[PDB]
Design a binder for this molecule. Structure first.
Ligand SMILES: CC(=O)N[C@@H]1[C@@H](O)[C@H](O)[C@@H](CO[C@@H]2O[C@H](CO[C@@H]3O[C@H](CO[C@@H]4O[C@H](CO)[C@@H](O)[C@H](O)[C@H]4NC(C)=O)[C@@H](O)[C@H](O)[C@H]3NC(C)=O)[C@@H](O)[C@H](O)[C@H]2NC(C)=O)O[C@H]1O
Length: 359
């Protein structure tokens, strides 16, 4: 994988159409767009998410467990790899799958309540402490690996847990068997165990992803690259591992690429403070020897409303941020999401700051 890495992060929800001929034209336009961009890598959505409801009910590949909305992942992948000149990473949820109801869901323990619950504002995650969950998610990854060819796996940012999670029974048993003492509420507020507990959960998530990676590699070979999305707070504010169960140093050690969600508006940063926020983030990375060499800075090309009516970020703004990264010594970056239907971001405005091939 020759450097710098320049990544387009792409949803196939945009490509899908009930009319097959329209879908064909859509795929053709997408392939040409990526070819024209002249960058290195596409992170390609393997699951359907038309509603942004934080739960995958259908996917883009044949498989044993979930409905296939359309057989298009493998078709788009091989064309991008041979016509558009890019590596392809299959972008897959780690936990947020709409599987058999008897599979354990991640739960949290509400303050002042005795029974654990599922928080409506989080990804609808299955518990990584349930071995049946590990097996069935494993099956989905094996099914993708069997039917499509690709160069890497991008593990979704839904591999996270808060400081009130996971409160489910198998998680409780796992903590007990690992030597943790007391209820979840006692552990999280125990000065002598709460840090160990956060790290235990971070390692549990990472180990689960490495298990999934091993299953794919058994099928497609050892050459498969791994990437995982990490939230910005665990990078800039490491104590936040306590409520993310993500550890930046761990990601750097465990994956070929750590894809940092360098998205200031997502993080609630004001428009006039976003540049400084990005400079602070990149300064933090550069202070960790060779972190920049294994990290991708992923910029946002939309401003999301937890409601659902997302707003585009201007092409000029995105190009400005890409320029900012380069001027601050960062060579590996990309953006999410791409919208081929509307040329958003505008390829002519983005290319000179994004493609090394630009003249
Ligand atoms: C006094 C004061 O206000 N200062 C505190 C300071 O002590 C502390 O740093 C922060 C955070 O405290 C910890 O917050 C944990 C998370 O709280 C939940 O955050 C939800 C929003 O999360 C954001 O989500 C976006 C993605 O959509 C992500 O990009 C972003 O980084 C996230 N932000 C953070 C900070 O994580 C929010 O909607 C939830 O309501 C909120 N839930 C709760 C229970 O607060 C929390 O789980 C920790 O317990 C809490 N513990 C500490 C810091 O002791 O808060 C400052 O205000």
């Amino acid at each position: 994988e020759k450097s710098p890495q320049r990544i387009m992060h792409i949803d196939l929800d945009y490509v899908y159409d009930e009319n097959l001929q329209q879908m064909d034209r859509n795929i053709d336009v997408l392939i040409q767009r990526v070819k024209d961009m002249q960058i290195s890598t596409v992170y390609l959505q393997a699951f359907a998410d038309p509603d942004g409801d934080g739960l995958v009910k259908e996917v883009w590949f044949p498989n044993r467990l979930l409905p296939m909305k359309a057989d298009i992942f493998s078709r788009v992948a091989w064309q991008l790899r041979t016509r558009s000149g890019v590596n392809i990473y299959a972008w897959m949820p780690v936990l947020s799958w709409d599987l058999d109801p008897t599979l354990t869901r991640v739960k949290y323990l509400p303050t002042g309540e005795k029974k654990a619950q599922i928080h409506p504002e989080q990804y609808h995650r299955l518990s990584p402490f349930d071995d049946r969950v590990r097996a069935q998610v494993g099956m989905l990854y094996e099914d993708l690996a069997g039917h499509a060819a690709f160069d890497g796996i991008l593990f979704h940012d839904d591999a996270l847990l808060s400081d009130y999670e996971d409160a489910s029974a198998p998680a409780i048993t796992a903590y007990q068997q690992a030597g943790f003492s007391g209820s979840l509420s006692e552990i999280r507020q125990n000065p002598e165990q709460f840090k160990q507990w956060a790290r235990f959960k971070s390692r549990a998530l990472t180990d689960f992803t490495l298990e999934l990676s091993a299953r794919v590699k058994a099928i497609r070979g050892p050459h498969i690259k791994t990437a995982r999305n990490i939230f910005a707070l665990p990078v800039i504010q490491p104590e936040s591992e306590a409520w993310f169960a993500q550890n930046y140093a761990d990601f750097l050690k465990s994956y070929d690429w750590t894809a940092i969600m360098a998205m200031p508006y997502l993080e609630g940063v004001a428009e006039k403070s976003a540049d400084q926020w990005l400079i602070q983030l990149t300064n933090q990375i550069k202070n960790i020897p060779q972190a920049k060499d294994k990290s991708i800075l992923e910029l946002q090309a939309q401003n999301w409303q937890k409601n659902g009516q997302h707003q585009a970020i201007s092409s000029q703004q995105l190009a400005h941020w890409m320029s900012l990264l380069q001027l601050n010594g960062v060579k590996n970056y990309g953006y999410y999401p791409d919208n081929f239907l509307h040329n958003q971001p505008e390829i002519d405005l983005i290319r000179p700051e994004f493609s090394t091939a630009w003249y």
